[PDB]
Amino acid sequence: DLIGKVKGSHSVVVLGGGPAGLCSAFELQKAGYKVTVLEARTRPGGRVWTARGGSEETDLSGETQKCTFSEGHFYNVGATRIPQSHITLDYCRELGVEIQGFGNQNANTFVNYQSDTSLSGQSVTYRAAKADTFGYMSELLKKATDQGALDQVLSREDKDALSEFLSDFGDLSDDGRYLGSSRRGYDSEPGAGLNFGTEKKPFAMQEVIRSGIGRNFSFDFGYDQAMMMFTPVGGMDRIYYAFQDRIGTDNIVFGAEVTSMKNVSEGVTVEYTAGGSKKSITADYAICTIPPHLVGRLQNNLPGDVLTALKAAKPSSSGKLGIEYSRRWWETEDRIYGGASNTDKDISQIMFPYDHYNSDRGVVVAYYSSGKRQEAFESLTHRQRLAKAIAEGSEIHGEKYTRDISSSFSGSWRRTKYSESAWANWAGATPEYEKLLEPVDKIYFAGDHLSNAIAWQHGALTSARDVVTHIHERVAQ
Amino acid sequence: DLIGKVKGSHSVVVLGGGPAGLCSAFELQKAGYKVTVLEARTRPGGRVWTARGGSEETDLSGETQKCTFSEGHFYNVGATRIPQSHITLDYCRELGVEIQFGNQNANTFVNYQSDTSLSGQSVTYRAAKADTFGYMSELLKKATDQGALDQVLSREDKDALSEFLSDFGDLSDDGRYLGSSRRGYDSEPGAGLNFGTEKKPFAMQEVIRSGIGRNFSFDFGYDQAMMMFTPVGGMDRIYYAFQDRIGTDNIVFGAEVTSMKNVSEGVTVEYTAGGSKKSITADYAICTIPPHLVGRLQNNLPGDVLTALKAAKPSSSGKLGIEYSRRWWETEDRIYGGASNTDKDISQIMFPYDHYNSDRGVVVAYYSSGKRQEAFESLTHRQRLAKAIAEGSEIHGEKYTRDISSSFSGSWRRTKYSESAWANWAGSATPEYEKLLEPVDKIYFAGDHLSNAIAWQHGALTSARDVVTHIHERVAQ
Ligand SMILES: Cc1cc2nc3c(=O)[nH]c(=O)nc-3n(C[C@H](O)[C@H](O)[C@H](O)COP(=O)(O)OP(=O)(O)OC[C@H]3O[C@@H](n4cnc5c(N)ncnc54)[C@H](O)[C@@H]3O)c2cc1C
Ligand SMILES: Cc1cc2nc3c(=O)[nH]c(=O)nc-3n(C[C@H](O)[C@H](O)[C@H](O)COP(=O)(O)OP(=O)(O)OC[C@H]3O[C@@H](n4cnc5c(N)ncnc54)[C@H](O)[C@@H]3O)c2cc1C
């Protein structure tokens, strides 16, 4: 248990029913607090948003998209993957939300980059790119070792042990050269009898180095990205519908746009508009999970230095676009089941689905880009986003990328009402971050921006748990 | 698709209802042949065997094991994982067999003996990789900066390589490996000022001499690289699906073949079923019985064919599953699927890819081959279990010994109607392999041993398809 049972009558109003708000309400309710969550949207989960057939969104440009994905088909417009260390998985267990493997690494997906080489704009599988990169890297280090370049730092035994590893890791010849590998894959698959197949031949060392084909390999090592990774079966939002059901819809007001938040003699008073009607609620404490750039728009009595600190959390651009195909060509032709292709093009990456394997249709994430390469889509209409996504995807996966398209749906977080950012990028552990960990009398801030895991649910959930613990200790005092 | 309808009446007898035999029968039927499969066991699938509650097996030593795993819990005693290029996935699609396999995991352990302080110490894959690639990258950058590779790299190549090594190894600005977040954390980063605490790096010489990177290249195997897949509920679901499409009226289970002879009208096969000596004659035969077992049959095969069969030498491999009543690997070690790897006889410990976050699970406590399976072969199941738990506790601690519900083991060189895990051709195509691709009048051999994917279902399936195609083309003239 996070906290013991609270003694007596104590109330909290939670602004925002995203992960931080719902986790806060869930934990406070467990401990016997009166809790009310106010959520502006008509769904729980905030930046955890899963697009399905029937999903409708009007963005800040006034464009309305209606998703028409087939029944059971979806994609996560925000949060989609979870590493093994994150408390998100603990909450999936607590809430009974089934998880499955998320394909965050795949030998068969492509890399495709521009360079001053003949590989420029050429798709190469990860396994081929890795085999060549690690083949030549191993050959070079073995050559230096054999030449005696590392004799001041390696003993004879160290050199022998290193050489053995390099021959294995690089699949080197008996004489220490990278000459290609079955690890690159096959143009024709090995079968039965005298059907030996045909190994894909290697690129030259100079091509490999000058193409930068290994620029994305270290992504595999990210603490929060390395396999194994996980995701909820049927969409990430299922975590937050599960929180909703545990909290009870009697304790959550949806379509409740908070317009004011003030410390008052009785506690904290929050005004909000719901169903076009003006409402007010007072509680002993408030947990404010509204994104920090949006908090200043509220009528408030926050001190100037708090308002200034909130502005240090700069908004960030990020967006996704999903295309439903009526043929799973990536599985049938490319032998790609999940994972992502990676590119320097604006689309940045193409993410293949982790469910309905071998089915008749599926949703591909045609782009998931951030920063400059999302600013390239942000101001386009959805139709224009789609056209650009298809063109760039076809340059990676061929003309099949353009065929068998059923429908599509995009989100761009900086243009999305009640988000206006994918995640915070603090100016400059900063003084503004540290300032916003302190309560403003009876108002506490929580969210992924006030964590060391920004842009992870873990950050939101651990922030909620810390803030609930602080309120509980204060009530005890 | 494979073949397009046969004209008139034609019959085939298939010896063995493993993957090659069932695939053969399935495709022949689709083309309009009369087919009868003779299978010695009471289950379809052969070396594709899934142990669940109720499984009973008596091995060639006379020991009977009775599996008592909880409903819905199982493990694959033989085939368990499938790469994306294999036709096994295409048959899963055709048969409606749902797929979901963790073949790489940053959080599982490596544990090897060495003349270092890491000897017999468990190290996570992510820590072992970060240190290995960190120091490897530092050393290659050092050699490059020194000028050791000036005769093979240009100035611009050196700069491009240095950039890659900095990021691949997570080197400091001055080119040293000093640790990384990639190693993981002793305390997880959370919210506020809860930064967590990184795990500190091992020293260079220790890392090199420990051999903790000796298994990293497994990640790159053409048939092992992620993404990998497996059928939901067990690998044997593929072969129960074949069984149901073929029809149990066309399969005689508990049918021990004792004779196979070319005769005037085709091939006559004698077998014992229901205690009775039976005979069947068909136009053609497809013999999928493992090659070392074929010689035991009464037959009229030419001497050179009998000699060729003996060149396919049998091999030792086996597995042992333990059902735990607590998923400690998930709750304590944050391991969700994947395998720990070791030089101990157990060889590896494979964690389950289903029932994530649930209350119980089956761990494959060993999967070993060759000498390291010969260490288990002659042991009783009780002795196998004791050895598995002893060696496993040396890797995963005392928790490995607790919450044990039940267990079940297979050793393929002691298993009736297998007596081998897979073949190794002496001289490894070899002349004996080539010889056995030829029909012996109306008798065709098929199986994974007559493929370039031995010890894969793909090998058995492509062998079946090739043999069915040969028969069809011969029937067509
Ligand atoms: C593109 C993208 C990719 C991501 N990738 C991952 C990933 O793969 N895995 C992962 O774990 N996380 C990922 N995340 C991060 C994850 O979505 C966030 O960490 C999490 O949603 C943060 O929760 P929060 O409660 O702090 O904020 P939010 O989710 O933003 O919730 C804030 C809530 O406040 C509400 N609100 C705003 N204004 C008002 C108002 N005036 N009145 C009432 N309510 C209001 C909003 O509607 C919203 O529901 C991703 C996010 C994005 C957008
Ligand atoms: C330990 C182990 C691990 C494996 N790992 C993988 C993996 O992860 N993925 C993968 O794809 N493959 C794997 N395989 C390989 C896979 O199991 C085989 O490739 C496949 O089972 C071979 O099919 P087959 O039809 O050639 O032979 P078998 O499966 O051996 O079938 C032969 C059949 O002949 C029958 N038979 C024998 N004698 C008689 C007789 N006298 N009369 C009647 N019938 C008889 C047997 O009962 C059996 O059903 C593994 C196998 C083992 C044992």
UniProtKB/Swiss-Prot annotation, chain A:
Cofactor annotation: FAD
Subcellular location: Cytoplasm
EC identifiers of the protein: 1.4.3.2
UniProt cofactor note: Binds 1 FAD per subunit.
Top-level taxon in the UniProt lineage: Bacteria
Binding-site list for FAD: 19-20, 39-41, 47, 78-81, 258, 448, 455-457
UniProt keywords, alphabetically: Cytoplasm, FAD, Flavoprotein, Glycoprotein, Nucleotide-binding, Oxidoreductase, Signal
pH profile of the protein: Optimum pH is 8-9.
InterPro entries, per database record: Amino_oxidase (IPR002937), FAD/NAD-bd_sf (IPR036188), Flavin_monoamine_oxidase (IPR050281), TAT_signal (IPR006311)
GO biological process, one term: amino acid catabolic process
Catalytic activity: an L-alpha-amino acid + O2 + H2O = a 2-oxocarboxylate + H2O2 + NH4(+); L-asparagine + O2 + H2O = 2-oxosuccinamate + H2O2 + NH4(+); L-methionine + O2 + H2O = 4-methylsulfanyl-2-oxobutanoate + H2O2 + NH4(+); L-phenylalanine + O2 + H2O = 3-phenylpyruvate + H2O2 + NH4(+)
Role noted for this protein: Catalyzes an oxidative deamination of basic, hydrophobic and aromatic L-amino acids, thus producing hydrogen peroxide that may contribute to the diverse toxic effects of this enzyme. Is active on most L-amino acid (39 on 43 tested) with the exception of L-Thr, L-Pro, and L-Gly.
Annotated PANTHER family: AMINE OXIDASE (PTHR10742:SF342), FLAVIN MONOAMINE OXIDASE (PTHR10742)
Family of this protein: Belongs to the flavin monoamine oxidase family. FIG1 subfamily.
Subunit structure: Homodimer; non-covalently linked.
Name used for this protein in its record: L-amino acid oxidase
Organism: Rhodococcus opacus (Nocardia opaca)
Source species taxonomy: Bacteria, Bacillati, Actinomycetota, Actinomycetes, Mycobacteriales
UniProtKB/Swiss-Prot annotation, chain B:
Major location category of this protein: cytoplasm
Localization per record: Cytoplasm
Keyword RNA-binding: no
pH dependence per the entry: Optimum pH is 8-9.
EC id: 1.4.3.2
GO-annotated molecular function: L-glutamate oxidase activity; L-lysine oxidase activity; L-phenylalaine oxidase activity; nucleotide binding
Record has Nucleotide-binding as a keyword: yes
Annotated substrate binding sites: 81, 224, 367, 455
Official protein name in the record: L-amino acid oxidase
Organism: Rhodococcus opacus
